[PDB]
Ligand binder design. Structure first.
Ligand SMILES: CCCCC/C=C\C/C=C\CCCCCCCC(=O)O[C@H](COC(=O)CCCCCCCCCCCCCCC)COP(=O)([O-])OCC[N+](C)(C)C
Ligand SMILES: CCCCC/C=C\C/C=C\CCCCCCCC(=O)O[C@H](COC(=O)CCCCCCCCCCCCCCC)COP(=O)([O-])OCC[N+](C)(C)C
Ligand SMILES: O=P(O)(O)O[C@@H]1[C@@H](OP(=O)(O)O)[C@H](OP(=O)(O)OP(=O)(O)O)[C@@H](OP(=O)(O)O)[C@H](OP(=O)(O)OP(=O)(O)O)[C@@H]1OP(=O)(O)O
Ligand SMILES: O=P(O)(O)O[C@@H]1[C@@H](OP(=O)(O)O)[C@H](OP(=O)(O)OP(=O)(O)O)[C@@H](OP(=O)(O)O)[C@H](OP(=O)(O)OP(=O)(O)O)[C@@H]1OP(=O)(O)O
Ligand SMILES: O=P(O)(O)O[C@@H]1[C@@H](OP(=O)(O)O)[C@H](OP(=O)(O)OP(=O)(O)O)[C@@H](OP(=O)(O)O)[C@H](OP(=O)(O)OP(=O)(O)O)[C@@H]1OP(=O)(O)O
Ligand SMILES: O=P(O)(O)O[C@@H]1[C@@H](OP(=O)(O)O)[C@H](OP(=O)(O)OP(=O)(O)O)[C@@H](OP(=O)(O)O)[C@H](OP(=O)(O)OP(=O)(O)O)[C@@H]1OP(=O)(O)O
Ligand SMILES: CC(C)CCC[C@@H](C)[C@H]1CC[C@H]2[C@@H]3CC=C4C[C@@H](O)CC[C@]4(C)[C@H]3CC[C@]12C
Ligand SMILES: CC(C)CCC[C@@H](C)[C@H]1CC[C@H]2[C@@H]3CC=C4C[C@@H](O)CC[C@]4(C)[C@H]3CC[C@]12C
Lengths: 570, 573
């Protein structure tokens, strides 16, 4: 039933062009039926053309399967050699070997699914052609060629699977098949695995509660402690989580193998539904805290505990040691954060750079944390922490840019490729220069030093430079657009995965606008350029920054899947 | 990966005992492996015993398959004869063609069920014998499968596939004028039972509506804590939403326990509402109800009177049930409209299971009708201040007894149709006890105002008939609706020989709740029908009506279970 949709869902994206073109055959058959008027000879010519196309597709499938089988055999040979060397040596090496064996088993299972689906598609398309043409020649062709095709009559893959299982059990697992087939099973992958019904119900419940609480908050607002600054970080984090769930959904639908790019376990992937559930729960907590602050239902309890607890809970949620509430994902995130914040002492993989960029787009959270620290230290001259700026504010603002710059320097050291890493480092240090000049101008504003205009002009120049640098890097390098190989997709690259180019153009325009918007937001937040409306401008701009980062994540992951722009894979 | 769960979720419940006992074989193999210590002799003995059980199961499967194949052949012959007669005959003809098409679809579905039975039994045999071979590290289970299972009649007979082909041909030729696509659009059988999970968007909508409902309920409670009787106006809506939610739970429980309500209710198996859709409808209606009540409490718009908010809600509900367009569950809405029309005109239609079941549901939802009549009285008179809440009249009693009247007339029609007096007349008397209780309560209430001197006699008669009605309804529920307290109980004390639900504690708690809430239901009907409690009657009725809905929910559970097990309602040949 609807074999085309099932095939499309179960097709491995990396081999999309190497599967059976079921839709093309369906379109050919329908066009032939529509154009049928001499009738017998026309039908004979159409049958000949269809058989030729089927033969071409069968040859393509056979050659692809043969090459993949040879690759699998070579991989098995090298893995066996590595296992023999490890045995001759006789813990971490054993773990790495087990991971490699699981990956090889996944590749074998993918090959088996490829051959099975190709055979099923051949059978289905031949049956459909026979039904439409009211002729039995399709079954004869299938039996003559497809039934005896090498891709369908090769059991070398099942034998490889059996040998891999036996080797894993006897050597790595110490002769117990029960331990094997776990981490070595390859459950349903991709869109072929519907999310749990309970997860979807929880996502819906959290979304509804969040919507109602947001409506209540809006009505209450329309009808001692700065709540905007405190809650902006939480709101931005919740928005980022929701937009990241959307990013994951789009990557799964667009065929972008973000699992491989992020070096995540293919057998256990946190679905977009789980991200939506986490975002909804965090938003529910955030809304409850804000409502409690507005109303103060408990008189004895102070108001300040309401935010402090909320974020604290989130912290306790992230650093929870109990194996519950996405414990594996939380531990992976904690390790990634530790690597990122200690960037110069670790290998900069794709995940580290991506999370550093996310932090760069989430510097408002760090700024709000520093502002809260200042408010607690001093305010508890009115508003001293807001009217006057200091160096620590600038350093906190530049911390994400510092992390990215040091990551780029480490990448340059590792690979010695000057051009990309050094250009990116300059593109991140433009931020240091801009923030430094803005802080100098703000500090000199209070004390007339006769050089305020010089610093203002320097800040404007470096603002323009940084905005142009970031925009050019995003459009040309992160997204790979404006390439010279665009045969038809003007201002884009030759290959695009997303259905519409209008998405690409809208993303280009929104990035152009929002890079300047975010640069303005950084300039306002890190100093006192606009003490009157600065807070509201930053609050309005930060969600726009998160949205820009979400679109950038979309297109950067697309480019990474299409091309090794980040050079994170051999 | 786990054939036990797949088999349990894919077995046809009506044939539950006719499938391979995969779980029993698993337990047997595990026990034998655990007791393994001489050793080879014990292994051989266990293998012999296990294979003897295998032959017994294979013989059972073959016999059942042969019986069902003979039944299918006879059904096909009868359908062919009927179709030939109809063709030779050529508004009644249109109905005859529709009925023949439905019968052919049902027979094709039975053929698909038999084919699924065959495939599942073969897969279970192969998977259990493979597990036995792996456990015993011997290549003999596969040999026995090849020698016996692979050559058994239930797997060496292709007559079911041939019958399926002939059914397709006949439906496509002499019932569809040669349009094969039209035939396959109705004969093809999608997954059944819990095989197909509900759509993700439907579950998300259910969750969203549940969350909105919860938050709005919390807001309503907070507003209440910190010109129009709102309790008597919104009780009907709240009870209807609760009843729909509990009905979704009932459908989920029937699906999980294997109670084939799709066949009991004569619903279309190829497409029927799941518990998720009922939850979604209940959540949306609850959202609307909560919004209306919040608008009443706050009145955000001053130009719009408060009375507009309730009415519109209920109006929308009506518009949500009689919507001509095919937009929102139109199939189920039209089926419910037809069932309601049949129930409210009971003495002119044959009483099927669905009609009696819906009449009973209404019997448990009489509070809605009472509230509607009270609001009619309020609008007629109040708009003595509280004249419609201080005295009782005949129309009030008639409205209270309307559902009981429908059930009683249905029982009388069933007696007139089947001519068996015992069950139908006992049930008719059970329902007429409600008439007697209501009328005596009304007489006492209307006589308590003037010194007729016969008030205490009416009060005593009302007490006697209240006890009589409570006992009658309880005995019918326990002995004639749930099929409990039977003489065939071997280990399920106070229950029947076969119980489909996992826990007997459920049955015991259901009996206790049935007793308590039957008495509560009788008390609430007495209080609401007439003055009786003139100050606390409304609160007691409001508290008890949800309890009546819960009682009707448990009763639905156990009545459907008993109907699936035994033909208690005699709605099937
Ligand atoms: C000042 C710092 C501000 C906080 C830092 C910023 C953001 C934190 C949140 C998310 C960033 C990580 C996104 C990774 C996306 C990769 C693509 C994908 O979606 O793939 C997912 C990534 O899932 C993850 O691992 C983690 C996802 C994030 C879960 C959210 C946790 C709570 C967030 C709130 C933090 C509270 C902080 C308090 C405030 C300071 C694959 O999931 P898996 O289960 O296969 O994971 C791998 C597990 N193996 C390797 C065992 C299979
Ligand atoms: C006294 C005042 C009014 C009292 C309340 C009235 C009615 C509610 C009671 C029961 C609803 C039916 C429950 C289904 C029982 C069978 C099991 C099952 O789940 O069967 C369902 C039937 O679904 C239903 O019928 C609909 C479910 C109920 C939805 C509620 C709609 C809104 C109601 C508004 C209330 C109006 C009052 C105005 C306010 C004052 C299977 O669906 P299918 O699609 O297979 O249907 C068969 C369709 N073929 C045969 C063509 C394929
Ligand atoms: O008679 P119909 O027209 O109602 O259904 C036929 C046809 O539909 P069609 O006319 O193209 O719309 C098939 O394609 P389809 O609509 O699902 O869709 P796609 O074009 O592939 O997207 C359908 O499923 P499938 O072959 O694609 O999986 C298949 O069902 P069924 O007997 O169960 O086949 P089995 O899987 O059990 O072998 C029937 O094939 P025939 O046996 O040759 O008559
Ligand atoms: O499977 P591995 O062998 O590659 O890695 C496993 C290993 O951790 P390592 O990497 O060596 O530090 C286990 O510790 P270990 O050596 O004492 O014992 P074992 O021989 O494995 O039993 C640990 O506890 P445990 O679960 O097995 O008891 C388990 O945690 P995890 O399932 O998350 O947590 P739970 O929710 O199940 O508690 C790891 O599972 P993965 O990370 O999913 O692979
Ligand atoms: O756990 P492992 O990996 O060491 O061995 C598992 C494997 O047995 P294997 O080696 O082929 O003999 C599964 O077969 P599989 O999917 O490959 O399929 P094929 O039949 O070959 O196509 C079998 O599933 P099942 O399909 O028979 O239902 C599963 O049974 P389990 O979950 O208990 O479920 P049930 O007993 O309730 O059915 C076994 O697990 P355990 O018995 O728990 O240890
Ligand atoms: O349920 P039914 O079979 O007893 O009755 C069907 C009948 O109309 P009715 O309801 O009896 O007045 C169809 O046309 P008809 O009179 O020529 O007679 P036949 O039934 O063919 O003899 C009608 O087709 P249409 O014009 O809408 O496409 C279809 O409408 P609708 O529910 O929207 O269903 P869909 O077709 O959109 O799926 C009805 O449901 P179904 O066929 O089950 O689907
Ligand atoms: C602000 C103005 C100028 C432009 C705003 C354009 C926004 C709406 C554009 C920018 C990038 C776009 C996204 C790019 C990729 C995908 C993945 C696809 O599988 C679904 C649509 C989705 C999620 C797009 C939705 C629309 C989108 C978010
Ligand atoms: C407090 C007392 C008096 C109420 C009576 C006990 C209630 C809790 C009992 C009575 C009947 C019971 C139900 C009977 C049948 C099923 C179907 C099963 O698949 C899941 C549990 C479920 C849904 C039970 C839940 C508990 C239940 C509702």
């Amino acid at each position: 039933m609807k074999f085309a949709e099932h095939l499309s869902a179960h097709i491995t994206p990396e081999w999309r062009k190497q599967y059976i073109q079921y839709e093309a055959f369906k379109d050919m058959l329908y066009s032939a039926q529509d154009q049928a008027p001499t009738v017998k000879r026309y039908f004979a010519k159409f049958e000949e053309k269809f058989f030729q196309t089927c033969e071409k597709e069968l040859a393509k499938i056979n050659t692809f399967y043969s090459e993949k089988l040879a690759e699998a055999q070579r991989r098995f040979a090298t893995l066996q050699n590595e296992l023999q060397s490890s045995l001759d040596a006789q813990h971490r090496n054993i773990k790495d070997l087990k991971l490699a064996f699981s990956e090889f088993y996944l590749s074998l299972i993918l090959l088996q699914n490829y051959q099975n689906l190709n055979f099923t598609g051949f059978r289905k398309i031949l049956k459909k052609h026979d039904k439409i043409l009211e002729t039995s020649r399709g079954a004869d062709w299938r039996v003559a060629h497809v039934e005896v095709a090498p891709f369908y009559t090769c059991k070398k893959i099942n034998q490889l699977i059996s040998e891999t299982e036996a080797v894993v059990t006897n050597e790595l697992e110490d002769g117990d098949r029960q331990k094997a087939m776990k981490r070595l099973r390859v459950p349903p992958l991709g869109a072929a695995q519907p999310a749990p019904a309970w997860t979807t119900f929880r996502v819906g419940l959290f979304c509804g509660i969040f919507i109602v609480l947001n409506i209540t908050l809006v009505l209450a607002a329309v009808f001692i402690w700065p709540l905007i600054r405190i809650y902006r970080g939480g709101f931005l984090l919740i928005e980022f989580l929701f937009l990241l769930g959307i990013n994951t959904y789009g990557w799964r639908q667009a065929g972008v193998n973000h699992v491989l790019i992020f070096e995540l376990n293919p057998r256990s992937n946190l679905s977009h539904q789980h991200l939506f559930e986490i975002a909804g729960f965090l938003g529910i907590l955030w809304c409850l805290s804000l409502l409690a602050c507005f109303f103060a239902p408990i008189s004895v309890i102070p108001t300040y505990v309401y935010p402090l607890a909320l974020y604290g809970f989130m912290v306790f949620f992230l650093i929870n040691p109990t194996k519950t509430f996405y414990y594996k994902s939380r531990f992976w995130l904690l390790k990634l954060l530790f690597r990122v914040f200690t960037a110069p002492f670790h290998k900069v993989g794709f995940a580290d750079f991506w999370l550093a960029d996310q932090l760069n787009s989430l510097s408002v959270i760090l700024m709000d944390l520093e502002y809260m620290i200042c408010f607690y230290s001093l305010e508890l001259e009115s508003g001293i922490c807001h009217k006057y700026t200091y160096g620590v504010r600038a350093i906190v603002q530049c911390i994400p840019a510092w992390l990215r710059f040091i990551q780029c320097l480490r990448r340059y050291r590792d690979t010695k490729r000057a051009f990309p890493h050094l250009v990116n480092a300059g593109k991140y240090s433009t931020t240091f220069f801009m923030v430094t000049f803005a802080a100098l101008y703000s500090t000199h504003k209070e004390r007339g030093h006769s050089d305020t205009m010089v610093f203002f002009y320097l800040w404007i120049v470096f603002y323009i430079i940084s905005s142009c640098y970031t925009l050019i890097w995003d459009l040309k390098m992160d997204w790979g657009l404006f390439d010279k190989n665009a045969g038809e997709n003007t201002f884009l690259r030759e290959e695009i995965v997303y259905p519409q180019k209008a998405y690409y153009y809208c993303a280009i325009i929104e990035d152009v606008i929002l890079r300047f918007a975010w640069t303005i937001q950084i300039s306002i937040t890190s100093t006192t350029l606009l003490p009157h409306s600065g807070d509201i401008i930053a609050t309005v701009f930060a969600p726009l920054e998160v949205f820009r980062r979400f679109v950038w994540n979309f297109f950067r992951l697309e480019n990474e899947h299409l091309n090794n722009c980040g050079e994170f894979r051999a």
